[PDB]
Structure formats: C-alpha cells, structure tokens
Write a structure and sequence with these properties.
The structure is cut from a larger assembly and holds 2 copies of chain A, 1 copy of chain B and 1 copy of chain D. By secondary structure, chain B is an alpha+beta fold. Chain B contains 17 helices and 19 strands. The longest helix of chain B has 22 residues. The longest helix of chain D has 23 residues. Chain D is elongated and about 90 Å long. Chains B and D meet through β2, α9 and α10 of B and α3, α5, α8, α9 and α11 of D. Chain A: This is T-complex protein 1 subunit beta.
Chain lengths: ~500, ~525, ~70, ~525
C-alpha cells in the first residue's frame, strides 16, 4: 500500500500534537481562557474540559502523530501526574522549535541531541531551584499543602479542593512512608449535597431495604464471601431446564423462587448474622432473607472490604467456602442511613485508621471526576513530596529558569546545537507566554525579565497570572514537587523527538 | 451480431496485429539477450526469457497473436530453445512487404516465393551440417562436455561450467532413454556456500516430517524399502461424524483413546508394509511422528509427489494408494537411504535406486535473485547437449550461416529476378535480424560485425559467426557455438509459413463480434 | 556567500564570544573560524561603527513610516 | 495488459527501489531515523529497521517486494546488512540511469557494476579475515554485539544479550559445521520483563507450570511422563460436542473422570515418571486428583511442544496413554517454574545439562516492541555473531570500506578497457551512499565527511579509522568498534548488484503499468 515521506510525516507530526497542544493551552500556565469541549460528532453535549486526557480521547486521537502525545501525555499524568496537560502542550511547544530548524534544514540528529542534551541541563537546572519545603514534617505537611496547592489548581471545583488538600496531605501523614491512594477509597455519588468531599466511616452502600427484614444490624462481624446467586444459585441444584408448553414459560419463572430459599438456610449453618454475599437481592428476597435470622447483605464492595481487610485485620479474597477461609470482617454498626428519599445501608463503626473511604457528593458526577485526578495527582505528587521535599516553583518559574542556563549554555555549551538547546530554552517559555497574555500581562516582559528575575535568583518570584502579574511562588503557595516537573518534561521530551526523527509512515 | 473486415485495412491490421507481439520476445533470448518479467495478473508476476512460456502467459488478442504462438512454440518443443527467434522471423518480412501493402501490390506469390526460399536454406542448412558425435573424439561424452561447456556458457555461469560441463554429460546419459526435467530435477541449496552445484544421480527429497525427536529418530537406511505413499495420518483419525454426546460419562474416554488407535493401524500398516524409510506426500502427524519416532522407522510427511515420482522412476517404484506395501516395485526400494543435510536442510537422498534414472543436482547460487540464471545454463545445456545427441549433424551456432545465406540467398536476387530479387533480397536479410538483435540486444553493433563475417562469407565461409558474449566476428563452430542443422531448419519453416499464412488472409470474420 | 554552514561556525564563534573571545573568529578564506590577530582578518573599526551607526537607524527610522502615503 | 521495455521499463524499475531506499537510508545505522508506520488496522509501528520497514512495507512496485525478500536472506545469516543492500540498490540504480542516458546499454551497465563488485568483495577480503573459537570470538562478538544489539537500540548495559548468543549458535551448531541453526536456537521473549532481563536456556522453557505448587515444584532429573492423553477435553475429533444441562448426568459424569484421571495419574506414578507432561493437559478436576495423588505434573501442552520437549531434551517419546510403559522417561534436568525476579513471567524450564537440542535464548523487556526491539537485537546480534563465531571476519563499517572498495574498483575500472570501464567506475561511485546517508544520519555533510574516510583510505587504505557511525565525535571504525562481518558486505554487495542486475537484465515488463505486484 502506502509509503509516506518525511515532510508530511514531520508536518502531520507538527500539526496534530500542536493542534492538541493548544487545546488546553489557555487553560495552562495559570488560568487564561478555559477550554470548552464541544461534542458534536458522537453526541450532542456542552462540555468544559481543561484536562488533556479527557480532551485527548474525546476528540479523535486517530492522528498517528496525535496518538504519540495523546499516549505520552496520558502516560505522564498517569505516572507523575498532571503531565498530560503539560506533555500535550510541551512537545507541541517543541514541535514548533525544530520546525524552524527543520525548515532551516538542521540535521534531525542535531535537534534530537541538543534538546535531549538541554532536556538534561534544564532538569539539571530544574534540580537547583527545586527547594525542600518538607524538611520539617509540619513544614512538610506545609510542603504537602503548597505542592497539592498547585495540583488542585486550574480545574473546575467549587469547594472540593479544600477536602483534598488536607487529605492528600493526610493520606501521607498517617501512612508513614507513602501516601494513601488505595487506602483512600473513592465514592463518587449524588447526595443531598451539590458540593461535598468528606470522610466515609467504613464505606456507605446504596439500597432500598424494605419489607419484613430488619433494616439495621448491631455488633456486626461480617462473613466475607464472594460466592452467591442472583436468580439462580451456584450449587449442584442451580440449573433446571423445563418448558414443554406456553404455561411452562410462566411456570419456569416460579421455580426461580425455589433457588433463592435454599441458600437462605445455608447462611444459617455458619449461623453468622452478618454475611456479605456481594451479589444483589430484591425486596421479595429481602422478604425471604428476613425470615431466617442469617441475613445476606447484597452488593458488598470489593475495595470496601479491602478497606475493611486493611484496618479490621481481616482478609479480601475471592469466592468463599467456610468462615475461616476468608477472615471475618468486623464492623461495630452496619446501619441504613437515608440520603434524600433513598436510604443507604452504611457500613460503619469503622472509621479511617489504616485506610479511608471518601464519599464525594457533588451536584453532578462531572464535578466528582475532576476532583479525583486533582486528588489522584495531588496524592501522587505528595508521595513525590514524601521522598523529595523539593518543590520547584510553579507558574513555569522553573521553565524560564530551566531556559536561563540552557540559553546561556547553548551559546557556550554547544558550538553547534545551540539551535536545539536555545530552541529548547525557547519553547520552555511558551507556557508562560500563552498564560501571561491570557493574564493580561505582556509575556515578553514575563518569560525573560521575570526569568532573569527568578533565573538570576528570585525564584519565589514567579507567575501570578490570575492577577496578570509576576507573583511569589512560595508566598502564593503555587509550587509543586520538583518530581512533578522533571518527568512531565521527560515524557514530553521524547513525545516530540519521536515524530521529529520519524521520516516515513507506512500504511496497510 | 457478427463482425468481419477485409482487405488492406484488415490486411494491414492483419500484419499490424502480428508485429506488435514479436517485440515481446525481441531483445530476449541470450546472455545479453534480455529477460521478461511479465505480470498478467494482479498477484501473478511471471518471468521468462522464452517466448512460448510468456506466449502461454500473455493474452493473444489477434488471430495473428494466436497464429504466432505455436509457430514460435514449434521451435520450443524441438530443442527446448528458439521460440523468441521464430517470433522475430515471422513478422520480419511483414515490415518488408509494408512497402508492397502500401503499394497495395500483392500477388500472393510473395509468400509462395519465400517457400522455395525457405527450401534452399533448410536444404543448405543440413548440407553444411556435420555430425559432432562420430567426428569428435572416439568418446562423444567430452564432445557433450564441449557442448555442455558451450551450452552452459550462453546464458549464465561459464565460471562453473568447467566443473558443471562434465556433469551435464553425466545427467544427459541418465536423462537419455527418458528425456525429462524431473530426472535432471535439481534441488537448490544455499548458505552452505555460494555458487556451486554437484550432480547426484540417485533421487533426493527436499522434504520430510520428523518430530518427537529427530537426532534420536533413524535418519538413514542402508537398505531402504521406500514407501511412496500419498497417505495422511493426522492428530486423531475419524471414521464417524457423530453419534451421541468435547464431555458424556462413558462417552468421553471412549472416543479419545480409539481416535488414537485408528491412527495406530495406518501407523502400523505403514511400518509392517516394509516402510522403514516412510514417505507420505500428505504429512505424517505429530503424534504419528511421536509414534513414528517411537517405532524408529524413518517417516516423511509434506513429501513432494515429484520426489515420490523421481523415486518411483529411479527405483522402478510406485506411489502407493495403500499404506500396506506388498510389492517392492509398488514400494520403492534402494540399497542406500540417508537423511543428510547439504546446506543444513533435512533431505532424504536415495542412491541405490535400481533404475536411478533421475539425476538430482544440489545447487548453490550467489544471492537470492542471482540463482535462477545459473541453472538455466545447466537446463539449457542438457537440452541442447541432448539436442547435440539427437541430431549429431551440427553446425555453427549463433546465426553463423544466415549472413552467408543472406548473401547466398540474395545472390539469387541477382540470379532469380525477373521480379523477386526483391522477395529474394527481402527474404535474405530477415535471417540476420535474430542474431543482429542478439548483437543489438547486446547493445553492440551488427552491420559492423555481421558484415565483417559477410566479407568472409564473401570468402565463401559459412560457419563464420559471432560469439554472443564477446560479440565480435568469429567462426561459431570453431568457437563450437552449436546447434544441430534441424534447429536452424525448423525455425525458418516454422516462421516461414507464419509469414506466409495470414498474408493469404485479407479478411477475418468474428461472429461473437467485439 | 563562502558556502559554509554558519550555524556551527557561528555557534562555534558563538561558543567563542559566548565564552567571549577576540583573537579568534570565523574566517571564510580557509572557510572556517580562525585567528583574529589583526591578520587582515581583524578590520578597521572606522567603517564598522559608521556602517553600524547607519542601517541601525534606517530600520527604526523607517519604522516610523508604516505611514507611507503616495501622490501616485 | 501492456508491454513495457527499455527506458520505459527502466524508469519503471527506478521509482520505488530508489524511493524505498530513502526512508531506509534515513533509517541507516543507529543515527538512522525512526519511522512511525501506521496500518489501516489502527496499528502504529516506529521503525528505523528497514527489514522491519520492508516487513511493514506492503507498498506496490514488485521490486519493492523483492527487497522485503532480499533483506531477510542477509537477515538470518549475516544479521545486519538488511537495510544497506536496499539503499545500495537505489544507489547503483540511479547510478545506472545516466549510463543509459549516456547510451551505455542495459546489459553493458549491470555487468560493469557486477564485476566491479567482485573487486569490492575481493577488496573486502583485505580488512580482517580472522577466525577464532567462541570464547575468543565473544570479545569481537560483544564488541559487535555492541553494534548489533546497539544499532538495534540498546546493546547498552548488556553482555547478557551479547554472550548468550556466543553460546546460542555455539551449542545448537558447531563452529566449523557453519550450518545455520537459528532454528535450533529458540529466541524467546516476554513482555513484562526487562531489557536487563535476558537469559540463555539450552533446553526448553514451557510457560505452563505445575498444576499446583502444593504439588512438588521440583521434579527430579528426567522422569518426565510423555503423555498425549486428555486430562481435559482433548478437542476430540469424533463427535458432536455438547455439555449436559441436567443434574442427573451432572452427577453421573463427575464420578467417571475421578476414577480414570487418578488411575491415569497413578499410572503415571506407575510409569515411574514423577512429572507428567500432557499434550492434552490438565483441567482442575484431574488436578485435584493430581494434587491428591501428590504427583508433580504438567497441564495443557502445545502439541508439537511435547515433541519439542522430546528432541530438545533428547526425550524419549511415550506417545499416548495407551502406549504406557515405565521404561521411556522424558528428559528434564530440573522441572520447575521459573520466576526471574519477574513473577508475572513464569515458565517451566526443562533444563538440559545432558541432551539439549533446542537452545532457548530468552530475553525480556517492558513491552511488545521493546522485547521485539530486544529480539531483533538478540536476533541479528547472534546472526552477525554467528558469522564471527564461525569465521570472525570483520570489516569496519561506515563507508571506511566503501572508499577502500571504491578506490581499487575505480582505477581497476579504468584498467579494464571494456565499456564497463565507466560502469565499473560508475560502480565505485554509488558505494559512497553508505557513509553518505550515515553521515546525514549522523548529521554530517557526507561529501566532505566521506572523503575524510577517503583521505583516510588515501592514507590508511583500510577501514580502521573512519567517520562517526555512532555520531560520537571520534571518527573511527575499528576504534569506534564499528565492526562488520567481512562475509556480510560480500553478502550485502552480491545481493544488491545481482538483484539489480536481473532488474537490469529484466527490461521487459508486461504489466498494466510501470510497476505491479
């Protein structure tokens, strides 16, 4: 079939990542113009997305060039965090650099090395202005707060960020040596609260508990089981095939009520009153499960039992056989707490400890998700805060400063590749450009003055571009782990350079 | 409806139809004679330097193109050689009478006069013809090596003909009494070395199937009883589609172990057939070879029928319809079997084939794409070495006589004419175009060279000719560039009528229309 | 004009005057960077300032006139 | 369809074979530039590997297929050189153009290139022809397994990839036999490993592990029960396949195979082989019995693999549960599942210190292309190594031989009075693409860069010093350890010139157009 040559392979390389790189641009740096996601192709929707990864897969990523940064940026946010928005823009900033060098016909080798060369030198330079805010654990808690402060920024959350700051701080604090991402348990629901993020005792659970069965339980010790039925039990008797007539199509459904009743007895051999069958039951089952005295509580969470398998000293395993196979979960009070017209069976009497369940009650499931990545990134980057107390100053205050030496380097350091390294030290400052003008400031007096203001050593001085100004990073508290700065480059660093040296595309 | 057309518009289209086709073979046929990659289908891409093959490959859209195929093909079956040139000669007059046809001048004797003209040559061709056999040595198999040398040298390697030409003789000897490609059938090899071959006069197998151990499974028999079998033995053997219900209960192990056993019978009926070396065009199975390597009787599967047939013709054996081999002639048999790797590939070689009339060649080339051109020297030489056997009367090759004849003929253009000095002149010159093409498809000059031959054809010398490699004047038979007289004889008589045929045709009827 | 890749040589001479340097500069004679000894390779300031005084203005001077108007 | 001949069919042949070389010469060498190549399948493949490009390449122009062939020839034996013969083709191809444009005949042109290639491959013989044993070769092997694995992107930090190859061809094939067995060397790789994870296995690693580790995870030396017998449904070819829905036959069946599989497993314990490899392997019901039998045994086995378990171990074949005898016992040095430190990677090495007939060189890596990168690393490394472990005959690369070859050819071209005196000298011309593209791969101006090597070869008259192949700044070949099997250039050359020569010998094209498949 097809053999593509470099020009398109390079230009399509240029356009797509640039085309996607400017999707979140005005949403990047500090907040400029936001980014509205219009979905006209697959549905009809009005959507607001400042997230690359969101924006990535929503719009068609099928541009093979876009696929690169779509992948690379996605991987980066998935690793170090909040890297997608970065990487998507960063290599997009990069593509424009060599594009001139490509236009200048600078050897593809030259731009590869020089950037990657300068990629070290800047992160090298990024290593210095990286400053430990976490030496003292309370200052580290304060380090955890400011580093989480730059993470939760720029997205859309009303009151939510305040719960996640301390929590990304607290997930680290109680765990001793890492943050709690999994010990934290994400519950995203619509409750009586248009904006809430709070701590969940045990983990809440949704159901309407009606009919005869007592709707509360006391002194719960849970028998943890993954084995059970829905309309047909898993056992020797769990299958019956009989229809000879049209009455039988009616009769075949009645014998389904035969299969539920025999397990209702089986929970009584263990005699255990608190038993999780993690598969659902209905009211008519709740009618039947209320007769025996051993209740089957339906739809028990896996991670919520893992939540319990953490603190309770119990076990999360699969299937089930007898009470000693999977250790007995225990919760002081399993209760049904009604949120709105609907009631919620709530596993409680177990509060935080080794783990956390976090129930977010938003006005929308939309507001519930944007806080997760905010949390998820603030969790990981505060786990980066753990080992490295270093926070290098945000608002691209590193970028210009990363660009400072590399500029000064590129002149000196290469006697050729300054083309790339300057271009490197050039593109680093694009992120400040797109915001500082979005800020109302003049980026020209930002990327370079404030650069040589902070790059010559006032690093707290940085972008407050939501005031349209230079701003004090430590004072603004706008800073994030030095570890969040490096790899988002290193991803984006190769995000560009791949398609740069890609000179051909074969197509089946 | 029905279509038809007459006269010059048809008649010129009659000769216009032909001249298009002869250019397919034009520069072809030789060492510097070009070669044709002809792709007549989407994934079907074919390569031949011979016309007849591509004639078979190409579409014939004309009665001319139709009437041409056999004419060239007529020289194919003869020597194995010379379609392309017969194609050249057929339409070679057609351009000479285009003066006449555009004169509109055609009494039909034009074709009728070229006939006695075709007579004076094929006569003279055999006159100057000389038996090489009883003339050369007392031996006449170094004569064949002379032919082999010369006839290994006209397409590709003259490097290896010093080694190969003696074997070309040896192949022909076992080839002669049954004239076959399969019994000179070559087995290519590569990677053990570059650019060599050696004659193996028993048969050889390119293919075989052995697993569950190989180096532990006997690969050789110093008295092979050769089962030539078309039989298949698969993972499990089945005589039934289904009966009852993969699981159930009694039914599960019931099918499986017997599905094993129905193999064992054919697994046995091979081994107690006197099949020790076992050869099955359809593959031996894995558990079959688990059995076969358990029974330590060498099996083979994925076996070439030709390999099966090369053996049955070399052993006097037979391909077998039954795993049981009652008859050692229905069976194959030898006094040697080996699985030996020449180049590293598993091969099953049979020496001790009682007939052993199948010579195999184990041949290495220079590269992937360089190998074809090599063995065609081996294949051509035999054909023409055998051709040197068949008609011992042999003249100079390389169109040596034509210029002489071209002179000798239009010598009658002085002698013949009240009229047809034209015809005799036009007849005389068309001879020269075949080697002149060979001269010119060498990118070299002919009127230069061929006339210099003619200057010594003006001496009366005839075998004076060109060695297509050097491409300069010479005496081909003294260079011993060879073809028997009958080779030159037919190509004329083949193309002569072809030049004569449709010229009687001013009209072609098509009922199907078009 | 000499037909030599300037970028490196420039960036060479850059990495020279980046480092700062006097005695060495690009020589298109050999075609590559070379000694500045005042070899003839280091050349009269008189011209340069004058030159460098001159077209330096003309830009900014003409930068005043984007306002060009024409009786044409 | 149409007849195409002469300059017509010439410029027919010229396009892709020239055009395809371009992406591959931009991919030439490690500094050769990668190519993202995306199917209509949604696939994406980033390849600076021309052999992979040609594989990835479905493009038209049958010649562009014939290179997909021609690289694979040199790919196995020589290893590296797959791409260069391609980019050398288009070199001498366009080189051939203007001689016909001169009026040098199509068969005049090819042969001038051809015999001049003889001098080249003959001049090639002058670089280093050495021959050494494996344990010496490893040094020139790993110095090349630098280049090979490295031109395959990260030899780096590996003699593990380098020196298992030193064993690979060594164990499967002798030094002197020179019979190519990469077929006997099992090149195996697994995602989820590491490039820093690479292993030689002289036997077979079977990914299937013990039914239960509660059953012994070490079977003693050999005592492997070769079993083609169902302990799960053996996809049996005879019957209509249906499971039963009734509790009646649900009970009638469950007592049935508990009897046989146990007495099968006990019959295995009776055959005296404490590992049962089963070509139709183990479901759980037989495994409880197997566990209850306390018999170490192997679950589902690939059909030919239990045979490959036979040969590679020298294992004597027990065909079927019907043939059972205690005498024939499969070979395993030690039967155990192997976690390398990569636990997601678990294979059961059948590890033969006695009879090893298939040597598994097992390499790992983070992901698919990664191990593939490492596989074609480990592939051509050994493949180049196989030459050098057999005949360690090294030319130093990057155009250092080209001038060296182009030199002698050039004058000797003029020495030949034949018309090809131009063509043979025109031959020596297109050799210069090799440092050329590499120069521009390395990002250098070739026309100067190459005559450096010329000035070198004018002085040196041998590849030792050279230009940068690795773009490292030390312009070297020997000293840059640019070390190429002297066989391969002779291979690579002969491949280019002769393929083209038939492309040059074939001027007669019946196609609907210039090119076709």
């Amino acid at each position: 079939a097809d053999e593509e040559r470099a020009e398109t392979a390079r230009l399509t390389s240029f356009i797509g990542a640039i085309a996607i790189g400017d999707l979140v641009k005005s949403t990047l740096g500090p907040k400029g113009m936001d980014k509205i996601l219009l979905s006209s192709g697959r549905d009809a929707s009005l959507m607001v997305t400042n997230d690359g990864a969101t924006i990535l897969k929503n719009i068609g990523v099928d541009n093979p060039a876009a696929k690169v940064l779509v992948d690379m940026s996605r991987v980066q946010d998935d690793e170090v965090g909040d890297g997608t928005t970065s990487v998507t823009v960063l290599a997009a900033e990069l593509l424009r650099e060599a594009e001139s060098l490509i236009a200048k016909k600078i050897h593809p080798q030259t731009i590869i090395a020089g950037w990657r060369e300068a990629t070290k030198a800047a992160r090298e330079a990024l290593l210095s202005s990286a400053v430990d805010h976490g030496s003292d654990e309370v200052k580290f808690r304060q380090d955890l707060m400011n580093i989480a402060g730059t993470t939760l920024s720029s997205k859309l959350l009303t009151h939510h960020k305040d719960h996640f700051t301390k929590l990304a701080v607290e997930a680290v604090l109680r765990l001793k040596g890492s943050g709690n991402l999994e010990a934290i348990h994400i519950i995203k629901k619509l409750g009586g609260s248009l904006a809430d993020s709070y701590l969940d005792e045990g983990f809440l659970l949704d159901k309407k508990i009606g009919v005869n069965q007592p709707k509360r339980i006391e002194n719960a010790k849970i028998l943890i089981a993954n084995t059970g039925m829905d309309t047909d039990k898993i056992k020797i008797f769990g299958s019956r095939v009989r229809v000879d007539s049209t009455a039988k199509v009616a009769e075949i459904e009645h014998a389904e009520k035969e299969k539920m009743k025999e397990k209702v007895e089986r929970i009584l051999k263990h005699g255990i009153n608190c038993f999780i069958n993690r598969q659902l039951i209905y009211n008519y089952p709740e009618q039947l499960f209320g007769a025996a005295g051993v209740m089957a509580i339906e739809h028990a969470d896996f991670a919520g039992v893992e939540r319990l398998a953490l603190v309770t000293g119990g076990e999360i395993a699969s299937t089930f056989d007898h009470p000693e196979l999977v250790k007995l979960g225990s919760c002081k009070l399993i209760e049904e707490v009604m949120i709105g017209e609907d009631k919620l069976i709530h596993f409680s009497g177990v509060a935080l400890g080794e783990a956390c369940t976090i129930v977010l009650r938003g006005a929308t499931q939309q507001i519930l998700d944007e806080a997760e990545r905010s949390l998820h990134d603030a969790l990981c980057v505060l786990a980066q805060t753990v080992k490295d107390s270093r926070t290098v100053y945000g608002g691209g205050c590193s970028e210009m400063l990363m660009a400072h030496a590399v500029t000064q380097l590129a002149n000196r350091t290469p006697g050729k590749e300054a083309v790339a390294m300057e271009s490197y030290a050039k593109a680093l400052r694009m992120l400040p450009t797109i915001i500082a003008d979005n800020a109302g400031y003049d980026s020209a007096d930002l990327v370079a003055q404030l650069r040589a203001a902070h790059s010559e050593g006032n690093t707290t001085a940085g972008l407050d571009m939501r005031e349209g100004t230079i701003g004090d990073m430590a004072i603004l508290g706008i800073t994030e782990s030095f570890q969040v700065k490096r790899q988002v480059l290193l991803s984006a660093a190769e995000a560009a350079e791949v398609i740069l040296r890609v000179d051909n595309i074969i197509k089946a | 409806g029905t279509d038809s057309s007459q006269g010059i518009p048809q008649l010129v289209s009659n000769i216009s139809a032909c001249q298009v086709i002869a250019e397919a073979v034009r520069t072809t046929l030789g060492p510097r004679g070009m070669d044709k990659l002809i792709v007549d289908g989407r994934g079907k891409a074919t390569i031949s330097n011979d016309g007849a093959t591509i004639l078979k490959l190409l579409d014939v859209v004309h009665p001319a193109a139709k009437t041409l195929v056999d004419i060239a093909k007529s020289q194919d079956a003869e020597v194995g050689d010379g379609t392309t040139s017969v194609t050249l000669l057929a339409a070679e007059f057609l351009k000479q009478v285009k003066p006449y046809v555009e004169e509109g001048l055609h009494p039909q004797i034009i074709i009728r006069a070229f006939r006695t003209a075709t007579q004076l040559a094929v006569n003279k061709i055999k006159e100057i013809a000389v038996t090489v056999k009883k003339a050369d040595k007392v031996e006449q198999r170094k004569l064949l090596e002379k032919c082999a040398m010369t006839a290994l040298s006209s397409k590709l390697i003259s490097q290896q003909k010093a080694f190969f030409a003696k074997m070309v003789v040896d192949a022909v000897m076992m080839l002669d009494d049954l004239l076959q490609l399969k019994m000179i059938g070559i087995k290519k090899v590569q990677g053990g070395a570059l650019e060599d071959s050696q004659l193996v006069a028993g048969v050889a197998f390119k293919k075989t199937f052995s697993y569950a151990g190989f180096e532990m499974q006997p690969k050789k028999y110093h008295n092979p009883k050769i089962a030539l079998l078309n039989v298949e033995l698969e993972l499990k053997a089945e005589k039934d589609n289904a009966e009852i219900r993969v699981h159930t209960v009694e039914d599960y192990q019931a099918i499986v172990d017997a599905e094993w056993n129905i193999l064992y019978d054919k697994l046995e009926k091979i081994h107690h057939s006197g099949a020790k070396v076992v050869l099955s065009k359809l593959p031996i199975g894995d558990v079959a070879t688990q059995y076969f390597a358990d029974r330590d009787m060498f099996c083979a599967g994925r076996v070439p029928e030709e390999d099966l047939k090369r053996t049955m013709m070399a052993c006097g054996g037979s391909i077998q319809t039954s795993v049981n081999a009652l008859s050692a002639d229905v069976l194959g048999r030898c006094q040697v079997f080996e699985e030996t790797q020449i180049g590293g590939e598993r091969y099953n070689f049979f020496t001790g084939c009682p007939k052993a009339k199948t010579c195999t060649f184990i041949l290495r080339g220079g590269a992937e794409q360089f190998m074809e051109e090599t063995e065609r020297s081996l294949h051509d030489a035999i054909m023409i070495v055998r051709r040197a056997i068949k008609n011992d009367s042999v003249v100079a090759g390389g169109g040596a006589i034509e210029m002489e004849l071209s002179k000798y003929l239009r010598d009658y253009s002085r002698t013949i004419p009240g009229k047809q000095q034209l015809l005799i002149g036009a007849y005389a010159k068309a001879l020269e175009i075949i080697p002149r093409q060979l001269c010119d498809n060498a990118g070299f000059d002919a009127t230069n060279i061929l006339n210099k031959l003619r200057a010594r054809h003006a001496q009366g010398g005839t075998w004076y000719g060109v060695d297509i490699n050097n491409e300069d004047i010479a005496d081909n038979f003294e260079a011993f560039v060879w073809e028997p007289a009958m080779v030159r004889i037919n190509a004329l008589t083949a193309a002569s009528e072809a030049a004569c045929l449709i010229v009687s045709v001013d009209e072609t009827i098509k009922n199907p229309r078009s | 004009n000499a037909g030599y890749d300037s970028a490196d040589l420039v960036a060479q001479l850059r990495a020279a005057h980046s480092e700062g340097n006097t005695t060495a500069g690009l020589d298109m004679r050999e075609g590559t960077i070379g000694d500045m000894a005042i070899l003839g390779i280091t050349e009269s300031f008189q011209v340069k300032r004058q030159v460098l005084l001159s077209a330096a203005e003309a830009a900014e001077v003409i930068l005043r006139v984007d306002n060009i108007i024409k009786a044409a | 369809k149409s007849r195409l001949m002469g300059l017509e069919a010439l410029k027919s042949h010229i396009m892709a074979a020239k055009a395809v070389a371009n992406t591959m010469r931009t991919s030439l060498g490690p500094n050769g530039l990668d190519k993202m190549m995306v199917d209509k399948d949604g696939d994406v493949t980033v390849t600076n590997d021309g052999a992979t490009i040609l594989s990835m390449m479905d493009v038209d122009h049958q010649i562009a297929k014939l290179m997909v062939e021609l690289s694979k020839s040199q790919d196995d034996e020589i290893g590296d050189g797959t791409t260069g013969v391609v980019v050398l083709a288009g070199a001498l191809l366009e080189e051939a153009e203007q001689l016909l444009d001169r009026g040098i005949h199509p068969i005049r042109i090819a042969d001038g290139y051809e015999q001049a290639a003889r001098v080249a491959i003959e001049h090639l013989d002058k670089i280093s022809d050495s021959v050494l044993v494996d344990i010496k070769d490893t040094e020139p092997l790993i110095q090349t397994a630098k280049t090979t694995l490295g031109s395959k992107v990260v030899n780096s930090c590996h003699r593990q990839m380098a020196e298992i190859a030193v064993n690979a061809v060594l164990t499967v094939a002798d030094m002197e036999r020179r019979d190519v067995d990469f077929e006997l060397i099992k090149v195996e790789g697994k995602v989820g490993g590491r490039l820093e994870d690479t292993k030689l296995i002289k036997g077979v690693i079977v990914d299937k592990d013990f039914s239960h580790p509660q059953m012994p995870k070490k079977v003693e030396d050999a005592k492997i029960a070769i079993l083609t017998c169902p302990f799960e449904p053996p996809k049996p070819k005879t019957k209509h396949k249906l499971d039963v829905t009734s509790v009646e036959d649900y009970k009638a069946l469950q007592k049935y195979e508990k009897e046989k599989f146990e007495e099968m497993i006990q019959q295995i314990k009776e055959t005296g082989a404490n590992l049962a490899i089963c070509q139709w392997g183990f479901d759980d019901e037989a495994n409880h019995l197997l566990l209850q039998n306390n018999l170490p045994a192997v679950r589902w086995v690939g059909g030919p693999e239990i045979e490959l378990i036979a040969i590679a171990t020298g294992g004597r074949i027990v065909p079927r549960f019907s043939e059972l005898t205690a005498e024939k016992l499969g070979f395993a040095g030690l039967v155990q599942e192997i976690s390398f430190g990569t636990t997601k990677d678990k294979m059961l090495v059948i590890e033969q210190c006695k009879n090893s007939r298939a040597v598994t060189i097992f390499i790992r890596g983070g992901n698919k292309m990664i191990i593939e990168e490492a596989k074609r690393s480990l592939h051509d490394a050994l493949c180049v190594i196989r030459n050098l472990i057999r005949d360690n005959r090294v030319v130093y690369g990057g155009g250092a031989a080209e001038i060296s070859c182009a030199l002698a050819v050039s004058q000797e071209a003029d020495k030949c009075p034949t018309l090809e005196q131009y063509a043979m000298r025109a031959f020596a011309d297109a050799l210069e693409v090799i440092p050329m593209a590499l120069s521009e791969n390395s990002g250098m101006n070739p026309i100067q860069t190459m005559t450096e090597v010329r000035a070198r070869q004018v002085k040196e008259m041998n590849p030792a010093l050279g230009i940068d192949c690795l773009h490292k700044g030390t312009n070297d070949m020997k000293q840059q350890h640019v070390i190429e099997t002297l066989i391969g250039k002779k291979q690579q050359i002969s491949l280019a010139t002769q393929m083209v020569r038939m492309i040059l010998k074939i001027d007669d094209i019946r196609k609907p157009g210039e090119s076709e498949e």
